Amino acid sequence: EELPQIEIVQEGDNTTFAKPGDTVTIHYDGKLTNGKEFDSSRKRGKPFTCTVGVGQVIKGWDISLTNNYGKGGANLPKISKGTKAILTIPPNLAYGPRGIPGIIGPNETLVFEVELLGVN
Numbered sequence: 001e002e003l004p005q006i007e008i009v010q011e012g013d014n015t016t017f018a019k020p021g022d023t024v025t026i027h028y029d030g031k032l033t034n035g036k037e038f039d040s041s042r043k044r045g046k047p048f049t050c051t052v053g054v055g056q057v058i059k060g061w062d063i064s065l066t067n068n069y070g071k072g073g074a075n076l077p078k079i080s081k082g083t084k085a086i087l088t089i090p091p092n093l094a095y096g097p098r099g100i101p102g103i104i105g106p107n108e109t110l111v112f113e114v115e116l117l118g119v120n
Contacts, residue, residue, distance in 0.1 A: 001075045002087045004060040009113075012082025017064050018119045025118035026065075030056025031111045037104055038110075047117055060089030060110070081119045087112040 019023050021070040030039040041048045048097045050057050053066040062069070064087045066116055067078045091097070097107045 001073070002090060002092055003076055004064050004087055004093055005075070006064055006074055006077055006079070007086040007088075008077055008079075009084040010086075012080035012116060014080045014082075016081035016119045017051070017078050017102065018052050020069050022052055022066075022120050023049060023051050023118075024065055024116060024120075025049045026114050026116050028112050029116040032104075033109050033111060049118075056087065057081075058094050060087065060093035060111075061112075062098060064091065065116070073095075079116055081116055084113075084115045087114060 004027060025047050026049075027041050028039075031037045053062050053063075053069055055062065055100050063073075063076070065079060067073075068071060068076060089112070090109045091109060094108065095104050097106050099108055103109070109117075
């Protein structure tokens with residue numbers, strides 16, 4: 001079963017974990033596998049707040065931030081509040097064959113360097 005890959009750069013508090021319906025606040029840089037940046041909250045000067053686990057972000061983000069809607073998965077570490085991680089998300093858990101014209105091409109793997117600042 002398809003899952004994003006998660007590299008834990010530095011662990012957070014190891015006790016606060018988002019569940020579906022929670023709001024999270026996160027800084028990120030989104031790049032293609034070739035290092036070309038397609039988006040970033042940091043250059044925007046403000047972190048990104050979203051509701052997780054309910055399809056209001058790409059599935060790869062939902063799975064990563066909620067640890068597969070609480071179900072976990074093989075080699076899928078939990079991301080606690082304060083954690084720095086790198087999420088690598090296959091196209092089927094992102095924008096698929098369709099992509100986003102002029103921003104993300106077809107069947108693109110996305111790499112997000114993230115810091116989870118807040119959970120609820």
